[PDB]
Amino acid sequence: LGGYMLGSAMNRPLIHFGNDYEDRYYRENMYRYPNQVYYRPVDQYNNQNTFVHDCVNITVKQHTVTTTTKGENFTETDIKMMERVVEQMCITQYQRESQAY
């Protein structure tokens, strides 16, 4: 929606998911996940957890609509992994937004 902003792109972290299948799955499917986040201006949140929570939901929602339009779909695992990595990226974005303000 409105008032959201799109952050600059970031390095996809290497992420370990705790078992052979998810590690392998992630390595193979990670190109399908966002490499940047949507967020509301940092002044508009009560703390880091709220900002991050919002950044994650909005970003994933938006990515899901644009991936769906291209005729592709996210599985439940996709959503879980995407959630974890977008949460990491949102934390980085908050940190970066924060040392200005």
UniProtKB/Swiss-Prot annotation:
Keyword annotations: Amyloid, Cell membrane, Copper, Disulfide bond, Glycoprotein, Golgi apparatus, GPI-anchor, Lipoprotein, Membrane, Metal-binding, Prion, Repeat, Signal, Zinc
Cysteine disulfide partners in this protein: 55-90
Subcellular location: Cell membrane; Golgi apparatus
Gene Ontology molecular function, alphabetical: copper ion binding
GO biological process: protein homooligomerization
Residues with glycosylation annotation: 57, 73
Domain of life: Eukaryota
GO CC field: Golgi apparatus; plasma membrane; side of membrane
Disease the record associates with this protein: Found in high quantity in the brain of animals infected with the degenerative neurological disease known as chronic wasting disease (CWD).
Quaternary data: Monomer and homodimer. Has a tendency to aggregate into amyloid fibrils containing a cross-beta spine, formed by a steric zipper of superposed beta-strands. Soluble oligomers may represent an intermediate stage on the path to fibril formation. Copper binding may promote oligomerization. Interacts with GRB2, APP, ERI3/PRNPIP and SYN1. Mislocalized cytosolically exposed PrP interacts with MGRN1; this interaction alters MGRN1 subcellular location and causes lysosomal enlargement. Interacts with KIAA1191.
Family in the record: Belongs to the prion family.
Domain remarks: The normal, monomeric form has a mainly alpha-helical structure. The disease-associated, protease-resistant form forms amyloid fibrils containing a cross-beta spine, formed by a steric zipper of superposed beta-strands. Disease mutations may favor intermolecular contacts via short beta strands, and may thereby trigger oligomerization.
Record's function text: Its primary physiological function is unclear. Has cytoprotective activity against internal or environmental stresses. May play a role in neuronal development and synaptic plasticity. May be required for neuronal myelin sheath maintenance. May play a role in iron uptake and iron homeostasis. Soluble oligomers are toxic to cultured neuroblastoma cells and induce apoptosis (in vitro). Association with GPC1 (via its heparan sulfate chains) targets PRNP to lipid rafts. Also provides Cu(2+) or Zn(2+) for the ascorbate-mediated GPC1 deaminase degradation of its heparan sulfate side chains.
Identification of the protein by name: Major prion protein
Upper classification of the organism: Eukaryota, Metazoa, Chordata, Craniata, Vertebrata
Gene: PRNP
